[PDB]
Amino acid sequence: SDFVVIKALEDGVNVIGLTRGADTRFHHSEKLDKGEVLIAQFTEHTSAIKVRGKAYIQTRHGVIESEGK
Amino acid sequence: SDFVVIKALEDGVNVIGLTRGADTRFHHSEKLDKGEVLIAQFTEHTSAIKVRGKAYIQTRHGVIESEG
Amino acid sequence: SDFVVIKALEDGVNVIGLTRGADTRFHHSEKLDKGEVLIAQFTEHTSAIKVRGKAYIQTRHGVIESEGK
Amino acid sequence: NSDFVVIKALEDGVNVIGLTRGADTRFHHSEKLDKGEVLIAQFTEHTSAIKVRGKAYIQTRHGVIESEGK
Amino acid sequence: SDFVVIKALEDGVNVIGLTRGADTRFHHSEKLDKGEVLIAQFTEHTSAIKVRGKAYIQTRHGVIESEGK
Amino acid sequence: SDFVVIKALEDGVNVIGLTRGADTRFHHSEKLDKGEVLIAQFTEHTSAIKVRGKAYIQTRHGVIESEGK
Amino acid sequence: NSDFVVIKALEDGVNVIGLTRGADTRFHHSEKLDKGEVLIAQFTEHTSAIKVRGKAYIQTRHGVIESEG
Amino acid sequence: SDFVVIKALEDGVNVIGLTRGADTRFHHSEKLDKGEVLIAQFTEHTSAIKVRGKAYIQTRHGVIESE
Amino acid sequence: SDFVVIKALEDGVNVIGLTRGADTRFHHSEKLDKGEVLIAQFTEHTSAIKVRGKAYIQTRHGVIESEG
Amino acid sequence: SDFVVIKALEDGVNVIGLTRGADTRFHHSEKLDKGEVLIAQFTEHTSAIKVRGKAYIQTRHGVIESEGK
Amino acid sequence: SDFVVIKALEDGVNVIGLTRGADTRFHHSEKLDKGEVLIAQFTEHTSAIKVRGKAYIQTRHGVIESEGK
Ligand SMILES: N[C@@H](Cc1c[nH]c2ccccc12)C(=O)O
Ligand SMILES: N[C@@H](Cc1c[nH]c2ccccc12)C(=O)O
Ligand SMILES: N[C@@H](Cc1c[nH]c2ccccc12)C(=O)O
Ligand SMILES: N[C@@H](Cc1c[nH]c2ccccc12)C(=O)O
Ligand SMILES: N[C@@H](Cc1c[nH]c2ccccc12)C(=O)O
Ligand SMILES: N[C@@H](Cc1c[nH]c2ccccc12)C(=O)O
Ligand SMILES: N[C@@H](Cc1c[nH]c2ccccc12)C(=O)O
Ligand SMILES: N[C@@H](Cc1c[nH]c2ccccc12)C(=O)O
Ligand SMILES: N[C@@H](Cc1c[nH]c2ccccc12)C(=O)O
Ligand SMILES: N[C@@H](Cc1c[nH]c2ccccc12)C(=O)O
Ligand SMILES: N[C@@H](Cc1c[nH]c2ccccc12)C(=O)O
Ligand SMILES: N[C@@H](Cc1c[nH]c2ccccc12)C(=O)O
């Protein structure tokens, strides 16, 4: 299954997993401090990921940067 | 399944999931504020995605921008 | 399954689903206003899509533009 | 899933015709397009060949081709 | 399955379906007039396709042109 | 399944299908006259194809040309 | 046949953390790398996201990324 | 399944099919005269192909010529 | 399944297999002397590989070098 | 499965098939004379192939040449 | 499965198969003299291959060369 790379460019970046299925809510929030890298798959439980905070993001479609709050 | 990357370029962008199946209605609207990124798949429940508001969007077919 | 990206270049664009199966009819018309984007799959229920109105469209085969009357 | 064709009508009354899959061949559906309208259509359980009549711009996995009307 | 694109470059082009199976014969002859485009798959019933008449043909292997007479 | 494109460069080109299975014999010869095009698959019944006569041939491995005597 | 990440520690004490697959998300394992060591780790039935903490050079299918201490 | 293209550059080229399985023998030899093309798959019955005689051959790996 | 190529650039390189499953520990350490090459898959038993010592490594993602 | 192309550059080249399974022995040696070409698959019975003698070899990984004793 | 090409650049090269499974031991050592080429798969019985001696090696990842003691 696909995965997303997220590198925190500041402290407190929040990588939020949203529930697969008929209902949509977050099920997990993973906090990243500056410089930490999370490599996360889509899964049986996670069908959408949201990033809040300043982060450098790689996906199969190229690079994208989130900008915090 | 494929996924779409949506970066909100203003506050209040809405990423709306349309229901898979014989009926078509909005089942969920994810609101993004300026700068937030959402990476969303097509799924058993979502067969079409609508973006309303200013956003930078990446799919397998390239980049496209919605305008509010 | 494949998908189409449609960006409305004017108000009142219609993205119309045609029914899969021995019967062919419109089962849904999604109305888009200027600047809105719709990313739509082929599915069990939809085996052809028709765009009416001015829109920028991306498929696996590249870009194409529909023009309104 | 299956391949699809993009058809952009370059004049009014373009006619996209779906031919029956199976041992017999006849049209089962005719979808008329006005100028500027786009139809994106798959091959399916019911449609194993597609004919285009009228002036249109067509994209497939093999590239671009243009039909020209009678 | 794969498919062939055939554009008739004169009237009365024949796109002919040969039967899949232990026996080989024509099961259908589609007649195309000048300018008409046919996009045709290999199928359960059709394992070979013959083009007679002047036509521009695209397959996965590139372009080829039939010539009538 | 793969397919071969064959364009007859003279009259009476023969595209011959050889039987899939423990035995190897000709099961069908398709005659092409100059300018006709045959697009033929490998199948449940056909596991090798022989061309005799002058013809332009395209496969996944590129172009080749048969020559008659 | 899953995807994998390559992690080369650029300083002592780098942590490569596996997060559990499923409805529950927690760290299940932390592999400590010292400077110069390389770990090549797959996504698995038990690991659906990987966090890197500490200075490291990382390779995925999406290209290179660096974690910062 | 993959296939090989063989164009005979002289008369009497032999394309030979070797048996798949625990045993290896020739089950079929197809004779090609000059200019004839044979496009042949690997199969349930044929797991190796031998070309004897001068021929132009194309595979997924490129061109090669027998002598 | 993917595989890694490891060429020992000094004696005593260790290519270590980590156990697939809920639990994680090293189950094997293959020792390589200078100039030897090991080509190793991921497998039912091995879901992560650690290289310790100076080595030239090739994967589907390109080259990387471990250092002593 | 994949296959290897072997062209003998001298007489008496040997293409040897090693047995798939817990045991490893030669089960078949195909002798090639100069100029002959053998296109051989990996199979249920053959999991490794050894070439002895001067030959030009093509695989999916490129060209290699074996050199006679 | 993937395979490795090994060309011995000196006499006495050893291509060693390591056992697939919870235990890891050498099950077979194929000895190659100078110029011989071995093309070997990963298999049900072999999940890791070791090359000892001077040899030119091709894999899907490119060329690598082993150097003898
Ligand atoms: N629960 C929703 C989550 C989701 C995925 N993609 C989306 C796109 C838009 C809105 C919601 C979603 C689903 O699995 O379908
Ligand atoms: N319920 C529809 C939603 C949809 C997907 N793609 C479409 C294209 C046009 C109209 C509606 C749709 C379906 O699953 O088929
Ligand atoms: N109901 C038709 C719809 C359709 C798909 N592609 C077409 C092409 C031409 C005409 C109709 C169609 C079917 O599923 O086959
Ligand atoms: N009924 C025919 C339609 C068709 C598909 N491709 C063709 C090519 C030639 C002629 C007819 C066909 C079939 O399903 O086989
Ligand atoms: N009935 C034959 C038709 C055919 C397909 N490919 C061919 C090549 C040569 C001759 C005939 C054929 C078959 O299905 O096998
Ligand atoms: N009956 C043979 C036909 C064949 C296919 N490829 C070949 C190569 C050589 C000789 C014969 C063949 C088979 O199905 O296996
Ligand atoms: N337990 C979560 C772990 C996870 C994977 N990707 C994520 C993205 C965001 C948050 C959590 C996750 C799951 O398997 O789905
Ligand atoms: N009967 C042998 C034929 C064979 C295929 N590839 C080979 C390579 C070497 C020697 C023999 C073979 C097999 O199916 O395995
Ligand atoms: N036992 C773990 C080993 C592992 C694989 N990838 C990892 C990433 C991080 C930590 C541990 C691992 C597993 O199979 O899931
Ligand atoms: N019988 C061994 C043959 C083999 C394949 N690849 C190898 C690599 C090294 C040594 C032996 C082999 C196997 O099937 O596993
Ligand atoms: N018996 C081990 C062999 C192995 C494959 N890859 C490895 C990497 C490291 C150590 C051992 C291995 C296995 O099948 O898993
Ligand atoms: N010999 C090893 C690995 C092993 C072999 N057979 C096993 C069966 C089950 C668990 C582990 C093993 C050990 O005892 O750990």
CA distance G54 to chain A (A): 7
Chain F residues inside the 8 Å CB shell of E55: 37
Phi-psi region of G36 (alpha: psi -120 to 50; beta: other; left: phi over 0): left
The answer to whether the CB of I41 is under 6 A from ligand 9 is no
Q: Which residues have a Cβ under 8 Å from the Cβ of C48 and sit 6 or more positions away?
A: C17, C18, C24, D31, D39, D40, D41, D42
Measured from the Cβ of residue C66, the count of other Cβ atoms closer than 10 Å reads 25
In sequence order, what are the beta bridge partners of C63? C58
Ligand 12 centre to CA of K21 (Å) is 9
CA distance F64 to K12: 44
Give the closest residue to D63 by CA, choosing from F62, E62, C67: E62
Residue A53 region by backbone torsions, left for phi larger than 0, else alpha for psi between -120 and 50, else beta: left
Residues of chain G whose C-beta is under 8 A from some C-beta in A? 3, 5, 19, 21-23, 25, 43, 48-53, 55-56, 58, 60-63, 65-69
What one-letter code names the amino acid at A67? E
**Cβ C7–B66 below 8 Å, yes or no?**
yes
Measured between alpha carbons, how far is C37 from C51 in angstroms, rounded to an integer?
13
Residue F66 near residue F55, CB atoms below 8 Å: yes
Q: Which phi and psi (to 5°) does residue J62 adopt?
A: 120, -165
- Dihedrals φ, ψ of C67, to 5°? -125, 130
Alpha carbon distance B44, H43 (integer Å) = 39
Asked if B57's CB is within 8 angstroms of C58's CB, the reply is: no
Residue of chain A whose Cα is closest to the Cα of B2: A2
G6 contacts I2? CB cut-off 8 A: no
Q: How far does the CA of residue B25 sit from the closest CA of chain A (Å)?
A: 13
Which residues share a beta bridge with G55? Answer: none
Angle, vertex CA A36, rays to CA A33 and CA A41, nearest 5: 115
Strand order in the sheet with A46-52: A26-32, A13-19, A46-52, B37-41, B3-8, B55-59, B62-66
Method used to solve the structure: X-ray
Q: Do B61 and C36 touch (CB under 8 A)?
A: no
Q: Please check whether residue G30 is in contact with residue I25, taking contact to mean a CB–CB distance below 8 angstroms.
A: no
- Residues in a beta bridge with I38: I6, K50
Query: Phi then psi for A67, rounded to 5 degrees?
Result: -135, 130
Chain H neighbors of F68, CB-CB under 8 A: 35
DSSP string, K1-69: --EEEEEESSTTEEEEEEEPSSS--EEEEEEE-TT-EEEEE--SSEEEEEEESSEEEEETTEEEEE---
Locate the chain D residue with the closest alpha carbon to C40: D40
CB contact under 8 A, D49 and E56: no
Distance G33 CA to ligand 11 centre (A): 20
Degrees, nearest 5: CA angle E42-D3-C9: 150
Whether the CB of E10 sits within 6 Å of ligand 4: no
- What is the Cα–Cα distance from C18 to C1, expressed in whole angstroms? 16
Q: What is the resolution of this structure in A?
A: 1.9
State which residues form the domain around G13.
Answer: 1-69
All chains having 3 or more CB pairs closer than 8 angstroms to chain H: F, J
Task: Map J40-67 to HEC letters.
Answer: EECCCCEEEEEEECCEEEEECCEEEEEC
Q: Please work out whether the CB of residue A43 comes within 6 Å of at least one atom of ligand 7.
A: yes
Q: After which residues is chain B broken (C to N over 2.5 A)?
A: none
* Edge-to-edge strand ranges of the sheet holding D38-42: C26-32, C13-19, C46-52, D38-42, D4-9, D56-60, D63-67
Joined together, the tokens standing for residue K21 give 């499974």
If one counts the domains in chain D, the total is 1
Identity of the residue in G25, G58, G61 whose CB atom sits nearest the CB atom of A37: G58
CB atoms K66 and I7 under 8 Å: yes
Distance between the two ends of chain D, CA-based, in angstroms? 34
Residue F50 CA to residue H38 CA, distance in Å, equals: 4
Candidates G48, G57, G58, G61: best to mutate against A (most CBs of A within 10 A) is G48
Closest-CA residue, ligand 6 atom 12, reads H17
Q: What is the CATH number of the domain that holds G56?
A: 2.60.40.50
Other CB atoms within a 10 A radius of the CB of residue A31 amount to 13
Contact call for residues H49 and H39 (beta carbons, < 8 A): no
Q: How many Cβ pairs within 8 Å bridge chains A and G?
A: 68
Q: Is A20 in the pocket of ligand 7 (CB under 6 A)?
A: no
C-alpha–C-alpha distance, residues A39 and A57, integer Å: 10
**Ligand 7 in reach of A46 Cβ (< 6 A):** yes
Q: Nearest-CA neighbor of J46 among J7, J4, J8, J9?
A: J4
Pocket mutation for ligand 4, best pick of E16, E28, E32 (most atoms within 8 Å of C-beta): E28
Yes or no, beta carbons of C59 and D37 under 8 Å apart: no
Look at K48 and I58 and tell me if their CB atoms are within 8 Å.
Answer: no
For residue H58 the two structure tokens come to: 């194309």
